[PDB]
């Protein structure tokens, strides 16, 4: 493959440019095209950043891009390296997210972090080095889930009904940090995701057994605990011997239901790109296994 990529700069880089570009060695930067030679405009997310179009659009563009690790900069050349599956690399988190050991990491567009400064880097003319966020899986599928629930809830609601609920949904709290999702528009892509959610939920409701349906009621008759209280409360405002006992029916239905559940899960789950096992005690870099 094109194991190395040359990025050439058209703007002459000052002393400060070369310095700050050197400090960024091992940062994860994406390229759209996977070519041996590219120009600095194609580097990063700045080619696509567009706040009138939503967060989901930039998410869709990013999840299809090719990701690279920055290496030594020389005169007007930056030398990006593509990681390969199963090997071990040192990666840099320019994002404000905390990494704990053993985390599985995903790539997402940046979110709004409180201070609003966000450290603009390499503003050459009116180009800018907009790097993505390398986020651990829990926060990644939390943002994907909240974004889907905003799309699914706020349809056919007016702005007055919507306002407080989506204000509460946009804010995510993760490891004592606080982030906000920038532009959650109701895209065409988001409507496709919502349609897949509806079909998968219909198949869950249709093909579920009677055991899988009625377990909770029987446990509530048998048992009482805080978890069961919460589960009952979710069903409350809408709220016997089996007449068929069929292990083959149960196996057929369950092997189909797991398929539908994986379909519904893929709307929330992102692709793991790195897995960490060593974290610098200042949380500025990690040792990672590259995955794809």
């Amino acid at each position: 493959m094109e194991a190395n990529i040359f990025c050439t700069f058209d703007h002459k880089l000052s002393i400060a440019d070369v310095g700050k570009l050197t400090k960024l060695v091992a940062a994860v930067v994406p390229i759209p095209q996977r070519l041996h030679l590219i120009k600095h405009y194609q580097l990063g997310l700045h080619q696509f950043v567009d706040h009138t179009r939503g967060y989901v659009r930039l998410r869709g563009l990013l999840r299809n891009m090719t990701l690279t690790l920055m290496r030594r900069v020389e005169g007007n050349q930056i030398l990006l390296h593509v990681p390969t599956h199963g090997l071990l690399y040192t990666v840099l988190n320019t994002g404000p997210v905390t990494w704990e050991k053993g985390d599985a990491l995903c790539v997402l567009p940046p979110l709004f972090h409180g201070p609003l400064a966000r450290e603009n880097l390499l503003t050459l003319g009116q180009w800018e080095l907009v790097l993505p966020w390398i986020v651990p899986m829990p926060l990644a599928l939390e943002i994907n889930q909240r974004l889907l629930i905003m799309g699914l809830f706020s349809l056919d609601r007016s702005y007055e009904e919507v306002k407080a609920a989506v204000q509460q949904l946009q804010t995510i709290t993760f490891r004592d940090a606080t982030f906000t999702i920038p532009d959650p528009v109701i895209d065409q892509h988001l409507l496709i995701d919502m349609k897949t959610a509806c079909l998968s939920m219909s198949m869950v409701a249709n093909l579920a057994s009677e055991l899988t349906m009625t377990y909770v009621r029987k446990l509530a008759l048998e048992d009482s605990s805080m978890l069961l209280v919460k589960c009952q409360e979710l069903l409350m405002r809408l709220d016997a011997r089996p007449q068929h006992v069929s292990p083959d029916d149960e196996i057929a239905r369950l092997s189909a239901l797991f398929v539908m559940l994986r379909q519904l899960d893929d709307l929330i789950r992102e692709q793991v790109v790195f897995t960490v096992c060593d974290v610098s005690p200042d949380n500025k870099s990690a040792t990672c296994i590259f995955k794809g």
Partner: protein, 240 residues
């Protein structure tokens, strides 16, 4: 750099495929001695719903040896469920001939080494190709009739992200999705798994794709070739 394995196959399966390259598939049976049967994409082209009448007749006219007849018999047995019985092995390297055949397949990497596909089974969503092309083997189930009819494909696409690929595959295969839900309505006592499944093959270059014929038993069947294929086998992952 390439990793190879050795397999033994009966002459009946080899009769059409004995050429120095092919995609090899292990197929499962509900039996004791012949549990697993090594099959090529040509043989599945018989059972596929997408292959044209002339080519299906050609392949049936070849695969009359008893081994292929038993292979197809076991292929049809359990409907809605083709892909569960199949595990995919690597692309084939040069072969040793005999009443018991020995052929070595490369399961990873690369070191001509081409991948051969029939013309009918090859589809491309995009009419222009990116410099790096990813190859997939996908199976889609049509529930329109009483029996399930499988459609077998080999796809080359610039998309490697799975969610984007499955979005576009759902966009193309919407009629089969409606057939799947309709099947759930009209035959409630039968429980299908999924609309279709996708498996990842390796990556190829867009300018190395060529269309040609591959003659056996003096019958000209048309073939697409990925000239310098590199093998990276993934899982059969299901989409609805």
């Amino acid at each position: 750099q390439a990793l190879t394995a050795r397999f033994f196959v009966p002459e009946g399966l080899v009769e059409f495929e004995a050429q120095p390259g092919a995609l090899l598939i292990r197929m499962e049976t509900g039996c004791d001695s012949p549990r697993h049967l090594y099959i090529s994409l040509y043989l599945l082209g018989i059972r596929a719903s997408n292959v044209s009448a002339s080519t299906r007749c050609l392949l049936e006219s070849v695969y009359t040896a008893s081994a292929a007849r038993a292979a197809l018999q076991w292929l049809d047995l359990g409907p809605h469920l083709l892909h569960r019985r199949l595990e995919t092995l690597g692309c084939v390297k040069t072969v040793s001939l005999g009443i018991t055949s020995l052929l070595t397949c490369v399961m990873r990497g690369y070191l001509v080494f081409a991948l051969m596909i029939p013309k009918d089974m090859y589809l491309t969503w995009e009419e222009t190709r990116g410099r790096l092309q990813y190859v997939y083997l996908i199976i889609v189930y049509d529930y329109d009739g009483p029996e399930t009819r499988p459609g077998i494909y080999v796809l080359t696409s610039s998309i490697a992200h799975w969610q984007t690929l499955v979005d576009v595959a759902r966009g193309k295969f919407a009629r089969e999705r409606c057939s799947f839900v309709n099947r759930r309505i009209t035959r409630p006592r039968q429980i299908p798994l999924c609309t279709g499944v996708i498996q990842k093959l390796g990556w190829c270059l867009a300018d190395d794709i060529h269309t040609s014929f591959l003659v056996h038993k003096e019958l000209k069947l048309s073939v697409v070739r990925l000239d310098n294929f590199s093998v990276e086998l993934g899982d059969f992952r299901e989409f609805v």
